[PDB]
Structure formats: structure tokens, C-alpha cells
Symmetry: D2
Subunit: 236 residues, 4 copies
């Protein structure tokens, strides 16, 4: 059912479904098998930042994930998202654990969409969360996601003693639909930034965090924990 465009921060190589044999960032267009990936060194317990950038002019969905020591991974993929997404969408963040686990803590998330037509006629949506609240009424939380008093978005279950749990899936979508393209726009652009804290005591962290764009009514697909990152009903 859902149509998904996602940038995944994939901490666990599932080499039997396309993953390269390392942690990676990837651009996912309607499939968990990334159309493009790049090797990503996830820094356990460090606060990372992902930036996702698209414009309809260059038609390049780009993402960069960095940590404070400056190591970064970038992935870009040429794609015309007008042909992929419906005109109205919701944007959100998703994360998973499976057999292995990790905290999928989002510390901030910002997003901007703009449709520039002809002629000083722009429609724009911008939000920025640097602090999430307990009762975050402009966010739709799905599955295991929760917003804490500590001001974070915990996309997957973390135990009272601070421990990430396995087989968790959770997503947070901005409440308002976004008009991410409009056929008379000369420029439809968006950008998204989030900061995250992936920490694991496990033998390996898993499974990752994705920023995604979906149909407005998108919900977690059945059994999308683990390697499917809460975005896809399957690994096709």
C-alpha cells in the first residue's frame, strides 16, 4: 500500500536483502533495497546529524550523516520524486531494532518544504523540533515511538534502566500533510535535518533510523521491525 521515499541510516548489514556488508546510509525509493548507499561508520553513543536535501530542479536526493569529529558519509541519487510520491505526503522519522538493538533517539528534527511557482508566490512548510515534549500534539507517534520529558524522541523502546529493546519499531510523522510537489511549481524542494543518538551495548547495533516521506495515511507495515526499518512490508 504505502509509497515510501526514505533516507536510511542503516546500522546493520543485512547482506541477503541488498545491504552492503557494512553500516551504510542509503536512499530508498519504494524499496528497502537502497538505490544508492554509502559506507557509514556509526559512532556508538555519539550524536549524529543527518541532512537530507532534494530539489526538483537538480532532481537529486542527497543525504549526509556526520558526527562531531567530522567523519561523514554522503549519498546522492538522481530521481524525480514527482514521479514517485503523491502530491501530498507526510514526512517522518522511523527506526527499528530486531535481533540486535540500539537506542534510536532523535534529539532534533527540522524540515522545510517549499513550492515556488510563478510569479513571489511560494508555499512553504517549515518545522523545527529541538526539544520534543511529552504530549507532542503536532507529531503522530506510531508503534513504539515516544517523546520523553528529557526532550527527546525515542523512536524505539528503551527500557526503564536506559536499555534499548529488540524487535521494536516506531515512527513519528509530522501531523500536517505536506504538499511536496505541485505540477505548476517551478521549484519543489525540501530539506530535513535530524540529530540522533544511536547507542548499543549489543554485539552489533541494529537496525537504524530513516527519515521518510510517505502517503498521508502511512502506518507501520506489519512485521517491519528489524531490517525493514518500519517502512516496508517486505524486502522486495
Amino acid at each position: 500500500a504505502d509509497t515510501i521515499v526514505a533516507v536510511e541510516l542503516d546500522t546493520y548489514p543485512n547482506t541477503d536483502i541488498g545491504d552492503p556488508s557494512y553500516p551504510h546510509i542509503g536512499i530508498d525509493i519504494k524499496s528497502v533495497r537502497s538505490k544508492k548507499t554509502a559506507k557509514w561508520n556509526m559512532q556508538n553513543g555519539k550524536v549524529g546529524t543527518a541532512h537530507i536535501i532534494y530539489n526538483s530542479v537538480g532532481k537529486r536526493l542527497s543525504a549526509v550523516v556526520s558526527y562531531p569529529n567530522g567523519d561523514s558519509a554522503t549519498v546522492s541519487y538522481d530521481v524525480d520524486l514527482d514521479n514517485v510520491l503523491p502530491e501530498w505526503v507526510r514526512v517522518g522519522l522511523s527506526a527499528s531494532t530486531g535481533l540486535y538493538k540500539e537506542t534510536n533517539t532523535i534529539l532534533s528534527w527540522s524540515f522545510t518544504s517549499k513550492l515556488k511557482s510563478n510569479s513571489h508566490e511560494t508555499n512553504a512548510l517549515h518545522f523545527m523540533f529541538n526539544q520534543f515534549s511529552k504530549d507532542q500534539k503536532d507529531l503522530i507517534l506510531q508503534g513504539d515511538a515516544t517523546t520523553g520529558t528529557e526532550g527527546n524522541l525515542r523512536l524505539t523502546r528503551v527500557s526503564s534502566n536506559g536499555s534499548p529493546q529488540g524487535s521494536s519499531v516506531g515512527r513519528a510523522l509530522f501531523y500536517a500533510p505536506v504538499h511536496i510537489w505541485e505540477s505548476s511549481a517551478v521549484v519543489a524542494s525540501f530539506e530535513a535535518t535530524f540529530t540522533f543518538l544511536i547507542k548499543s551495548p549489543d554485539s552489533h547495533p541494529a537496525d537504524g533510523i530513516a527519515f521518510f516521506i510517505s502517503n498521508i495515511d502511512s502506518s507501520i507495515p506489519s512485521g517491519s521491525t528489524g531490517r525493514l526499518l518500519g517502512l516496508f512490508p517486505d524486502a522486495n
Copy 2:
């Protein structure tokens, strides 16, 4: 039930409920009887712009409505909106006709809310509509409001032949709730701008347009057409 803070562009003097005896802009806090007004020369058939500005520092809700020839009216009112509004709100635009009538056409609407805490931790919501679409999924339309193909928001009924109808009420609220204050914010500010086209063939235009802030579940009060501008169940 609803809690309303509004800036009204009031085209019709209802002198028996507080209006001054002229068209006016006013600041309405939980009552249609404006706490403060200023004489406003509505320019029939011209495109006006209203700007509404509040910050929690100066605690002054300010509004200015202007037309291209530069005539403008300003109203300011000292008020602590933390004590008025709930923490989460919806923001919107409302307009009415009663016995007299006018087009209450909104050509653009923009809004920004920011909560600045301590410490480069800001939450922000910004939207901008310069063109409304027919199926405007990030707007909640109430009552007679409609968004047209022409890219406008018609808050009240306009006849197929372009004529405004009487006894109309309509509102458009942004879909996402807004967090307009948060007690640990050092600055909670917002601003709103809209452009409007009030045209009437009537002996007098009525009744006006308001930008308002309300509880998230706000709906048009019963019999709020006319002088109550779709905001208030009564003239108290």
C-alpha cells in the same frame, strides 16, 4: 467552550456590542468586544494585508492592516497570552457576513511560531500559503470556507456569479496544532500575515475577517455569522 484570541478586521460597526462607530481593526481576547480597536478604512475591492505580531517578551499583541496606497491602521494591546491560551492551539482565519455581505477572500496567509528555550534549542512552525489549492490537505475548512482553483481561500460563500452571500461564516485553520507557549521558553513569539480582498456591492460591507488562535478542537460556534465573525457564541 472555545478560547479565542483574535485580530479582527471588522468592516461593520455593531455599536450595540462594543464596536466603535466605524470600520475597525481590533484585538479580541476571549470576547468579540475588542480590548482595543483602531479606526480602519476598509478599501472596497482592494487587496489588503494584515500583519499580526506577538512576543512573550514585550507581551504586546500588535496588528497592522494596510492597503497598497499605504493607508494603514494599527492596533496594539498589552496582554500575556500565556495566561489566555492553552499551550497548544490551532491558528486560523475566520470571516463572516450577516445582513450585509462582502467577499472575504484570502489571497495568502503565513504564520510563524517559535519557542526559544535555553540553551540554540528552538521549536518553530512556519507556514506560508501564497496559493491555496482545491484540496488543501493542511488546512481545516469550516463552515462556508472553500479553497478555489483560482488559488484563493474564500472564507465565506460567494455566488457562482462572483457575488458574496449574506449569513455566511467560514474558517480555515492550519491542520497541525501549534505549541504557542511553553513555560520554559524564554521567548514564545508568533507572527501571522495574510492578504485579503474584501469587496462588496452592498449598502455597507459586513462583517469582517479575523485571524484567530483557539483551542485545537475549536469549531464555529452556533449562530456566529455576522457580527460574531465566526469566533464567539455571543457578544459578551
Copy 3:
């Protein structure tokens, strides 16, 4: 001397120096011979909008020029501007006439540069001119450029009777240097938008308008009127 990156709106095909045999938009990196062009139908006397977009992630300089009837031309070019430009620059607008002529009237110009590092540490510059004033102290006007009372930037000479003159060159650069890249930035992006009105009574319009980025001390090169668009000392 100068280093120039430019998006040109080139109204005159100078086929002996690389131009294609039509009006075109092009991306110029250190040469007037565009690395990339696209056919552009200049609409005489209509107000056009150009949008220029770059990010250091996708490393794609993109431009689109459109008119209100929606005809548009787009050009994109993969390039790493960190390797082209100095770290600090000035940004501006340039236009020329030669043997043929045209008004090169800019009605608005906006620009944003951002350097996003690690870690909610962004440097940003944004300006927007929708109205230029006579004494525009945040603009550096070179050559024939002038800002009028009418609120426009006339990059090339227009006669008192409204007529564009030949052999004119003029540029307007934003006063403050811009830091358009910084090697520790994870994202260095910029965007620029301007609206323009190219009108000509001539047998052909010429020569065009460019948005450019240059070294801070950039000045009009000698004999850069006409086909060199006020950017290049020569056609190499």
C-alpha cells in the same frame, strides 16, 4: 584575475564563442563558455524568475528560469564549488548589452548561504530585496547599474525615455562578503532567486543577465560589455 561562477540568462546566441544557436540559460564556471546550457525562450517584456540552487552534498549547481505562463528552462551541472571558488566571495547580479540591447531590470533578488557544521552550529546569510532603493547601501553597484525610485535594479543603462542602451555593463553585488564554503562544513548550500524584466525593441535582445559568485574584490572586467556579460575579460 577574478574567479567567476555564474548562471547566465543569455538572450543572444554568440555561436562563435560556444553559445548554442538560441537564447539559453547556462552554468558558467570560470568561463563564459557555459559548461552546460539549456534552450531558453526569453519572453520579451515579461517578468521572469530565475532560481539558482547549489548544495555541497549533491554538488549540483542548478538553475531554472520561468515566466508566469509557466514556460521554463532548467540547467544543472555537477560541480564541486569548493574547488572552484574561494572560501569567501561576493554574490551579485550582472548584465550586458552590446550591439543589441535590452533592459536588464531586476525587480527582486534574494539569496541564502548556509554553512552547517557539526554539531546545531550553522552560519547563514540571507538577504532579500523586493524593492531596491535609490541609495542602496548594502549593494555595490558597478558600471552602469543603478537602483531607481521605482524600486528596481537597472543593471544596464536605460534612457530617460525608457529605452535600453547598447554597450552597457552593470553589476550589483551584495555588500557583505559571503562565506560560501568552509572545509569543516558538512553542508554548504546556497540559493538565489531573482526576478527580472528583459524588454527590447531591438531586432534581437542582447546580451543577458547573470547571477554570479566571485572573489570579494571582483570588479567588471575591461571590455566585458556584450557577450561577456560583465563577468569575463575574454571568451576563453
Copy 4:
């Protein structure tokens, strides 16, 4: 000569020139004797944030200074800055030490000015420094001010061993002039935010930090160290 509007973070009570007998924030219009002040508990060695807000609608210059534990001081003052400032200005930050001393370290500074006319015609300037660089070409440094490799703006002299020096004055002004009012603007607003770190080993910290607005050619007045905060030739 200079015309100064300033918000001062005044760490040292100079009770013989108007200061109240405590550290205070104040709004200074053409005089170091603040038109309005508020008691401010400066938290030695903590990172503070000041927010300064003005709009020409409400005509209230407002400032709030806060620290992460949430203690804050606010000051507001009704004033029409169109009658005070010239139309074009420079904006900057100033700080002083005298007999007592303190670090006057600025960690970030952001500013926005907007002139909204009639009719989707806004001029705007926004800058944001979250990191200052050594060679900060869009800043004018005066007196003792320096930008470090550490990414801070040290408005006053700090010794190689980290110690603030006495009798220091330094200012940083944004390079481009700002058009802070224009008589046909319906709204002329600005806001400024900076974060600062005032640390002192002294028996008392002194003298403070100001954000100011001045004539474009403003320079440090002779003998404006200490209680005059680098803004005023005297205490009148």
C-alpha cells in the same frame, strides 16, 4: 557623533551614572543611562543568551537574557526607533572592561531585519554566526575584538593564559549596512540573538556586553572602555 540604540548586559553597577545598584539589562537610547533596566543576575562562567526584539507596530524594544538554569531578566521599552535611528545602520556587539574585568566572549550571534511594505514585497537581512572564524570577512572588528580559532568572538582582550584584561573595549559590527526602517514600510522589525560567556576571576565582573545599532560609520568612542561599554563618548 554616533547615534546609538543598545541593549546592554551591564555586569557592573556604576551608581553615579544611572545604573541601578545591581547587575542589570537595560535599553539605551542615545545614552548610557538606560531608559529602562531590569535586575540581571549574571552567572559567572555560564553561557547566557540574549534575545532582542523590536517591531515598528508595537514600537516596543524588548530584551530578555537567560541562562540554562532558566533564570532570566527581561526589559521592554516603548520607543519609536524611526525617530531615533537613521534609516541605514550597522548592527553590532560591543563589550568593555575597566578597572574590573570579565571575558566578553560571544559564542553566537544572529540578526534579522525585515521591512514589509505594501504589497508580498519584503526586504530582509538575516545572518547567523554560530561559529566565528579567524578571518571573519563579514564582520567589522573594532578595538580589542577578535575572532578566534575556537569559533568565538572575543569582544575584549583575553590574555594568552585565558585571563580577561582590564580597560578593554571591542566591538563587532556586521559588514553590510542594514536598512532598519523605511518610511513606506508597514512593518520594520528586527531581532537579534546572541550567546555569550561572561567569566571573571575579579572581585567583581565588569563591564558588560551590548548589542547595538548605530550609524553605518560608527566607531568606538574615545575612552569608552569601562562603564560606557564602547558605545558612548560620555555618561550623559
